[PDB]
């Protein structure tokens, strides 16, 4: 769509809405794009706001060289333009930043000495403008994550800023705080002596004091008048903005100076006390670009706006809750919707393996680790992950497994490991048991009935991290089992009809992703025995309506399912037979 252009796309989810399909498109055999879909198609648009991403290895303007630091030379990152001089070269300002931020202290305090370096919190990096790149086109300093400004003409006056001034009741300003996303200086004005670049390329030094939030710049060994004071807990990204008038633009020197701790100490926690400068592979140059997609939400907030009257003004009313689960990248201080991982493969893979690690650390009755993991993966996030239809299949399976391992696996295993034993007490309830429900020799529904055999005890502990008592660690964390039961029943009921239509858009992308996790959760709940009476009757009808009719829909057994789902159905049918065997044993004891 161009400037001031309005358009609409109809994917033909409802065939009646297509205006010209019948006159041209129906007879020729052509099909609507969303003809066999139950849920709305997700549309992705071009992002308006640029973001910082690592320079591609195949970029046709920017080239990045990683120079390993020798004993006498600091590690360097070198930025060059490959297409300079030739036609189609980029004359616009390019914004560069480092991938890792420096963390200012939460509460501001108020031979180089090894002890001084160990106790200091001041870090340093230097930028060498190569002789030939005009310093008036190069700016050096720090930026925050909020910086998303892409202007062809950049100036230090145009940077966004605000001055929050708090005062007392009388009105005197007892503190004034300046806030900005950009804290950078210009090399042209920084070259105070003049001719300093000619003999040797300018080495602009950036010094940050994480304990005080003071940003000081040193050019050619003299401290420039320009300085900044940032708020506590501010995250500062090293950044260099440069318009290239040369094939070689500048360099990122990761060295250190007298009494100043190297930057790799402030970036990485493992090297907090290592004076030797380092450039680990995580650190890499990123640039601001517009090549990103954005995922339009399937549902928006329902807001009603109307003018009540002459006096009452305009009314804005929102009353229904809508939520989304957000993925936070710790290093970049960014947060994205987890449903955006359908197009980000590396993040999807890493998060799926993280979920597997979560399920593995608490495996086999590690109740303390399960309690700890309840802090990272919460009950509402698990429930939303279970319910959501647009979630990627890998994340769906991972979250199902995480829920099962954290809350249900312990008791499920406890009941399974005591399954082929039958210790039945000698009580009147046992005596009342009979093989057949009535005079007619008609088998009752499996599972439904009176079972008196001794069974393990279900116990759970409430996960709280404000209680000093350690007796909570035993027993797995508590979960809303009734809510989970109702959700599982509802979603199985929906999936039975959804799959039978053979829609092209199953939940999770495939029939396996749709069914295997959900049937696995159902099997776990059945094994633990939460299902009682009417719920078991309804789910047996779902499994097979005709056979389990109490005395047109096709149950799971007759839907032509994939092999992984067939295996789970086999497990369910095994459990039903085990229930029948237990009922027979109890009736035998009753007769005895």
């Amino acid at each position: 769509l161009g400037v001031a252009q309005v358009g609409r796309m109809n994917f033909g989810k409802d065939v009646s809405t297509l205006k010209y399909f019948t006159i041209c498109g129906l007879q020729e055999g052509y099909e609507p794009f969303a003809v066999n879909t139950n849920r709305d198609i997700t549309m992705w648009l071009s992002k308006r706001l640029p973001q910082f991403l690592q320079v591609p290895s195949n970029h046709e303007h920017i080239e990045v060289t990683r120079i390993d630091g020798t004993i006498d030379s600091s590690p360097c990152l070198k930025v060059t333009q490959k297409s300079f001089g030739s036609q189609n070269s980029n004359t616009d300002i390019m914004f560069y930043r480092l991938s890792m931020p420096i963390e200012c202290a939460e509460v501001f305090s108020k031979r180089d000495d090894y002890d001084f370096l160990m106790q200091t919190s001041t870090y340093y990096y230097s930028v060498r403008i190569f002789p030939g790149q005009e310093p008036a086109n190069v700016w050096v300093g720090w930026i925050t994550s909020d910086f998303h400004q892409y202007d062809t003409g950049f100036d230090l006056d145009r940077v966004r800023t605000v001055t929050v001034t708090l005062g007392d009741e009388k009105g005197k300003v007892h503190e004034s705080i300046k806030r900005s996303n950009c804290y950078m200086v210009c090399a042209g004005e920084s070259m105070s002596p003049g001719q300093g670049r000619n003999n040797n390329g300018l080495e602009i030094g950036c010094v940050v004091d994480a304990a005080s939030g003071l940003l000081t710049f040193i050019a050619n060994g003299k401290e420039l008048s320009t300085y900044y004071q940032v708020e506590p807990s501010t995250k500062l990204f090293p950044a260099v903005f440069a318009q290239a008038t040369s094939p070689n633009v500048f360099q990122f020197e990761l060295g250190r100076i007298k009494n100043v701790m190297p930057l790799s100490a402030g970036l990485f926690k493992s090297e907090h006390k290592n004076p030797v400068p380092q450039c680990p592979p995580r650190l890499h140059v990123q640039f601001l670009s517009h090549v990103l997609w954005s995922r339009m939400p399937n549902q928006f907030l329902k807001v009603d706006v109307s003018r009540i009257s002459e006096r009452q003004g305009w009314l804005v009313q929102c009353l229904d809750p809508l939520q989304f689960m957000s993925l936070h990248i710790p290093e970049e201080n960014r947060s994205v919707d987890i449903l955006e991982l359908t197009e980000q493969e590396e993040l999807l893979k890493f998060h799926y393996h993280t979920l597997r690690l979560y399920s593995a650390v608490c495996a086999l009755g590690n109740h303390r680790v399960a309690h700890a993991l309840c802090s990272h993966v919460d009950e509402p996030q698990l429930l939303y992950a279970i319910e959501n239809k647009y979630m990627p299949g890998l994340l769906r399976a991972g979250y199902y497994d995480l829920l099962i391992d954290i809350h249900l696996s312990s008791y499920a295993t406890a009941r399974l490991m005591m399954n082929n034993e039958y210790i039945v007490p000698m009580t009147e309830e046992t005596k009342s048991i009979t093989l057949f429900p009535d005079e007619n020799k008609k088998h009752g529904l499996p599972g439904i009935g009176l079972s008196t055999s001794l069974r393990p005890r279900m116990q759970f502990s409430s996960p709280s991290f404000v209680s000093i008592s350690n007796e909570c660690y035993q027993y797995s964390p508590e979960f809303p089992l009734d809510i989970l039961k109702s959700k599982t029943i509802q979603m199985l009921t929906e999936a039975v009809k959804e799959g039978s239509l053979h829609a092209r858009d199953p939940v999770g992308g495939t029939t396996e992703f749709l069914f295997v996790p959900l049937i696995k959760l159902f099997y776990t709940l059945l094994i633990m025995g939460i299902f009682h009476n009417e719920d078991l009757k309804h789910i047996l009808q779902l499994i097979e309506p005709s056979v389990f009719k109490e005395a047109p829909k096709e149950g799971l057994l007759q839907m032509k399912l994939p092999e992984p789902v067939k295996l789970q159905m086999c497990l369910l049918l095994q459990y039903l037979c085990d229930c029948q065997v237990r009922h027979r044993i109890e009736a035998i004891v009753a007769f005895s």
């Binding site: 001031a4 609409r8 708090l166 329902k302 305009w314 929102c318 990248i329 990272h376």
Partner: protein, 434 residues
């Protein structure tokens, strides 16, 4: 070469070693999956016999000696300086081939992996090196998967190095797989390893991606686009009020969002600038917006507590009056007629400002824009003009979504392209010089 020696007198079989390593890898290549079951079993049996013969003849220690002898040189350039240009060129390839050969020799064999338990400690000592990280990690993965005994050697000092590999080298799912294999092997869980991995990786919240449920937040703004510029007929003071008819503190597990204030546009476009469209961000979550939640002053996604008589989060029946003065950049707020002891100052004025409210589910708010549209409960501060006076003559004041996309049917959704710059907001009279 290590003993001081004259270079050309040393005969270093670089090409022969490379070709032999290439042949040995093919000699230990695992069977292909599409092969028939019987053929695959035969190839697996032959591979196992080859591995057993090699381990019995001690070909693992020879590879280990070669690897250790090659790691004395830090880099390919250093090795080239010591030996020669071709040796420096082939150094990295020889190291990778040696590590692949070791992995192929120990893969799938439990006895070899059990014999590698002693050398496990020596292997993890170079995991940090970028020259051999992938091969060392693959060998570690094979040993940990195939040998139950191997897990008993792994200690805290070995687990923390693997964890710090994630921090130094970035996100890599193979490290996660190795950490998973450490916890459970052959259905047996190592609780010490589980506890160590949890206590050393989870509390940091700095490597693994984090998750949380965030309420959706939407913004409403009036039609008015007011700004300040030289040689313009725009009044520089404005005033409007917001009334909270009803609010629910917790409609969900997270607290209800309700912020009011002013926001600006990047340039002269009618599109709000610097902020994302759909998500959990509202007034004051960017450097283009300025908010007040009743207890804090929001700007740039940092909140500072501001004092007021009887401070409270915005409740039912609260009147918030907002003042904007563009002559000297200043945004001030007054709650229920009392003054809020704080204000925004000296912000960028190269744009157009408009009233804005951000909220989540569970609100009922009202714009008192003054005049015909609204009735002010409190008398505007002297000098400030009410916001209804900025409406253009032919336009009608209304409250619409700040962002262009709202909730509606898919096929009825109006997709919008870029909008033309709204320069008509500032009427700058420029007669032709004569």
């Amino acid at each position: 070469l290590s003993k001081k020696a004259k270079a050309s007198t040393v005969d270093l079989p670089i090409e022969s070693v490379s070709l032999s390593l290439q042949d040995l890898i093919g000699y230990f290549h695992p069977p292909d999956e599409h092969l028939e079951h019987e053929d695959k079993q035969n190839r697996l049996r032959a591979l196992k016999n080859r591995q057993n013969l090699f381990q019995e003849e001690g070909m693992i220690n020879l590879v280990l000696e070669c690897i250790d002898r090659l790691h004395v040189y830090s880099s390919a350039a250093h090795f080239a300086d010591v030996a020669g240009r071709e040796a420096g060129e082939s150094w990295k390839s020889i190291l990778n081939s040696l590590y692949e050969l070791l992995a192929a020799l120990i893969r799938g064999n439990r006895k070899n992996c059990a014999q590698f338990s002693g050398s496990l400690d020596w292997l993890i000592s170079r995991l940090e090196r970028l020259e051999a990280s992938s091969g060392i990690l693959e060998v570690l993965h094979c040993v940990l998967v195939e040998s139950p005994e191997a897990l008993n050697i792994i200690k805290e000092g070995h687990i923390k190095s693997i964890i710090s590999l994630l921090d130094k080298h970035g996100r890599n799912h193979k490290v996660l797989d190795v950490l998973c294999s450490l916890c459970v092997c052959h259905g047996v869980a190592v609780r010490s390893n589980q506890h160590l991995i949890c206590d050393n990786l989870l509390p940091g919240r700095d490597l693994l991606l984090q998750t949380r449920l965030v309420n959706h937040v939407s913004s409403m703004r009036p039609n008015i686009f007011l700004g300040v510029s030289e040689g313009s007929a725009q009044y520089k003071k404005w005033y409007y009020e917001l009334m909270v008819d009803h609010t629910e503190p917790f409609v969900t597990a997270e607290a209800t969002h309700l912020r009011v204030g002013w926001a600006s546009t990047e340039g002269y476009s009618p599109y709000p600038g610097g902020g994302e469209e759909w998500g959990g961000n509202g007034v004051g979550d960017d450097l283009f917006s300025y908010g007040f939640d009743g207890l804090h002053l929001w700007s740039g996604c940092i909140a500072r507590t501001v004092s007021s008589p009887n401070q409270h989060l915005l409740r039912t029946d609260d009147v918030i009056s907002c003042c904007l003065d563009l002559s000297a950049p200043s945004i001030s707020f007054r709650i229920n007629g009392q003054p809020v002891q704080g204000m925004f100052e000296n912000f960028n004025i190269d744009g157009l400002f408009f009233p804005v409210v951000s909220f989540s589910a569970g609100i009922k708010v009202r714009f008192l824009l003054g005049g015909r549209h609204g009735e002010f409960k409190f008398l505007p501060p002297p000098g400030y003009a009410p916001c209804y006076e900025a409406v253009l003559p032919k336009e009608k004041l209304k409250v619409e979504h700040s962002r262009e996309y709202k909730q509606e049917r898919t096929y009825t959704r109006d997709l919008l392209g870029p909008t033309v710059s709204l320069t008509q907001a500032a009427f700058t009279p420029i007669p032709v010089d004569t």
